[PDB]
A paper describes a structure:
We bypassed the problem that NO2- decomposes during RT neutron data collection by using formic acid, a stable analog of NO2- and an inhibitor of NO2- reduction. The electron density shows that formate binds to the T2Cu atom, although it has low occupancy (0.54). Formate assumes a κ1-O mode, which is observed in a previously reported cryogenic structure. This finding suggests that differences of data collection temperature do not affect the binding mode of indecomposable ligands. Therefore, the difference of the NO2- binding manners is probably caused by X-ray photoreduction that is greatly facilitated at higher temperatures. This finding means that the ligand at this position can easily absorb and desorb H+ at RT and interconvert between OH- and H2O.
CuNIRs typically have an ∼110 kDa homotrimeric structure, like a Reuleaux triangle. Each protomer contains one type 1 copper (T1Cu) and one type 2 copper (T2Cu) site. The Cys residue forms a peptide-bond bridge (Cys-His bridge) together with one of the His ligands at the T2Cu site to transfer the electron to the catalytic T2Cu site, which is coordinated by three His residues and an axial water molecule.
Residue numbers in the entry:
A (entry chain A), B (entry chain A), C (entry chain A): 15 to 315
The structure:
Amino acid sequence: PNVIAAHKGVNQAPVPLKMERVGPHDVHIEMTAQITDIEIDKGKIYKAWTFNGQAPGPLVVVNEGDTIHFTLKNMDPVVPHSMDFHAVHASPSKDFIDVMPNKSGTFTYPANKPGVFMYHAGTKPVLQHIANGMHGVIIVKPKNGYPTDKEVDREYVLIQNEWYKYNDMNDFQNGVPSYVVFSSKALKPGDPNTNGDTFTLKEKPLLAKVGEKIRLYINNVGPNEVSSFHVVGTVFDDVYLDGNPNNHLQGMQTVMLPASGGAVVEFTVTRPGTYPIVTHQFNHAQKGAVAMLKVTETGED
Amino acid sequence: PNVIAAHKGVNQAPVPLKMERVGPHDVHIEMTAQITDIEIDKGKIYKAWTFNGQAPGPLVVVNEGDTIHFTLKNMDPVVPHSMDFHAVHASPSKDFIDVMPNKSGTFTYPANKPGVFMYHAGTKPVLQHIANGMHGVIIVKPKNGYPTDKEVDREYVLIQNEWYKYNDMNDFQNGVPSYVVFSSKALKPGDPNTNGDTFTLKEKPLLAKVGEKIRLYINNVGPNEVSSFHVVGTVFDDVYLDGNPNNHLQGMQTVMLPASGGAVVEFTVTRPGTYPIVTHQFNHAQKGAVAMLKVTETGED
Amino acid sequence: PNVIAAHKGVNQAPVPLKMERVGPHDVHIEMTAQITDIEIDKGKIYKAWTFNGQAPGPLVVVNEGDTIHFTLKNMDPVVPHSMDFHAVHASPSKDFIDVMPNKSGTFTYPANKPGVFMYHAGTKPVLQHIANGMHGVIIVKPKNGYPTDKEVDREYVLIQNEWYKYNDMNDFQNGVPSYVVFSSKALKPGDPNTNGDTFTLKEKPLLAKVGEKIRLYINNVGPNEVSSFHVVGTVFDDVYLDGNPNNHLQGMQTVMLPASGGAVVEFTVTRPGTYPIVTHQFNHAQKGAVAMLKVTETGED
Ligand SMILES: [Cu+2]
Ligand SMILES: [Cu+2]
Ligand SMILES: [Cu+2]
Ligand SMILES: [Cu+2]
Ligand SMILES: [Cu+2]
Ligand SMILES: [Cu+2]
Ligand SMILES: [Cu+2]
Ligand SMILES: [Cu+2]
Ligand SMILES: [Cu+2]
């Protein structure tokens, strides 16, 4: 359950995601694997294993049908890391392979399917890499959109994850989570971009305006728990399981998400006030998994 | 993990739900918050935090499009309580607010969406209020019914909940349930109306007649567990997730319910006998979550 | 948590499933209940309570609309056993009854609904019988097939189950699983047929050829956990919940399965390599629930 000697005193500053389109259906993405201290609860630092110094990692957004030319630069001084995108068709033993310390690797694979996909490290033991922070979301936008696109006023991305005792494989396998948390990742400049902690989305709530229809792209990265996702004070008008437009449910109070499962959910906020966003497995909500949406008459705070 | 000193010796007798329609699309509902001893297992009393002296609370049935004018009278001598209906569009910070001891509050909000919705207290810590008994179901009947209405012979309502060590926030967050239980709530005069205990629906089974198609309205209120709902000896002909007629599945053996999730399920019983109703997460079934349906040639016992 | 004295030194050799069609819509099936040592992890023997000396038990495949004439021969010297098929309409108290040691019983019931159904012992306490190994799958093939039948190149059956401390009712109710495992059952001669262990499907992977569309029939028998089923390196093109052709989802990364829940999932493998098959609840994957699919240019190893 200990800290790797070579990580003592290592705290690598966050590095921005690099992404550029190189053709109509081809995108370059470069990420790092790095060791970064994150305050997951007030007064509690976790020396996380991260992509780009965030946990969950940075949001990646591509279009349906894009081929991704992905480079991972491993800045960890001792532990290999790798990348597995749930969005892609790839050979795990050729394309999701380990990149050694202070090396890079480049892999190419297509994102054929629209949706809200988990990404994570694929290095054995996978549980250890996920639990220590190596998870995130890639959104693949559908070529023809969603049937409800014209009704949506505002969009945000939320992610649920757990935290355990530091680097403790016994706890990761057999224990209950110490914290369960939400984070938000920016779809556009100015949106909140946060890490998985117990407090930021309570103290700095997401904003909306009375009468708006909100869309959330959500994924429960786990590693271990399922999620019962609910927004207090509203009902989901439309739900698309895994973000695929064909998996269309209506009028849900709560959306069941497996570990790694995603959804697009849409709902209307009819009155001003503060709306909690929870997992309705309330032991997890009590351990941190409550975010806030503040709805005002103007949409500003 | 203790008993509040002011609740020592308090056992407030159940009070009937009060509901009256005041217009074609407007309904008044008055409930209490009260402290009531419930026998959750033989020889085991839980001094529950309840609505109206039942846990889960009384069934509320309204029509799609009704506006609810809801009054809560708090009879607890020391703890504030509140009401959150998953059925409604409301401002949580204005409409789901605490009512102080020996006060009342009135709130108004619409139920726009059909289905089988959880209700519960919204007072912090929400986990504590739910785990101590402040949960229940509100059914919103669809304006145009369900496509299978003409095939259904009999209807019942079941609810699943957990019980933990008394008022023990550590156990509520980190422990396994001590009991997991079903209760049934009356849709019409004469139907069974019970509390969440390990024994009543085994000793006094629900009744049906050979060849009938039964509909169950079900909700898993939690607080913490998901449910794998199954009726032994049959297969669900039709399932409507959250009770919304558009979320229509067929031929399911078992229905996955998130915490707070609901469904309408319909099935046929072809032969006389006793049919267990379970969560198929069998550790929970062993801890109380088995109800019985007795099917006879006449439908009487 | 002990071994029954009468099972000390008992290790009954596996007996083949007996099945013969006796009419266009009538099938005879004969199974045993027997006590058989299974190596569930390297160096760890579990003296399992089984059907036919396998755990999970043998695969049963029938056609939609078949009536099953089922015989159970109980070879256990002291414990009664029984059979509950989720596929059938039956009276649990008449048709799923106990067969005493060294007796047989015969029961008749129809399989009206297509899908991938759990079977298990129905003897009280059911949790004890399931946890000790008395579970399996019955597939009911749809009369008109699946809409995607013409696209499928290869089929396999996988089952997920847990193992606990030996015959320990406290652990079964309150503990975390010691192991979570996959097994594969043969649809046709030559397919792998294995027991639920931590290693066989890693050391002897399932085979496929580059470019194939694979169909898996899957069921999570539990007893206690839900499953977040995922194949690394691909996305499910089509999913049929519980194997019913009408419950059709597309483009899922991960399929949520309740305890006893099934699915038919189909996906394409585009590149050669080894593809892990997991539950994405990664504590369970770490405890054994990883199988391998080896994809080669020829489909041979
Ligand atoms: Cu390139
Ligand atoms: Cu890593
Ligand atoms: Cu994954
Ligand atoms: Cu009024
Ligand atoms: Cu309360
Ligand atoms: Cu709620
Ligand atoms: Cu016969
Ligand atoms: Cu048995
Ligand atoms: Cu069963």
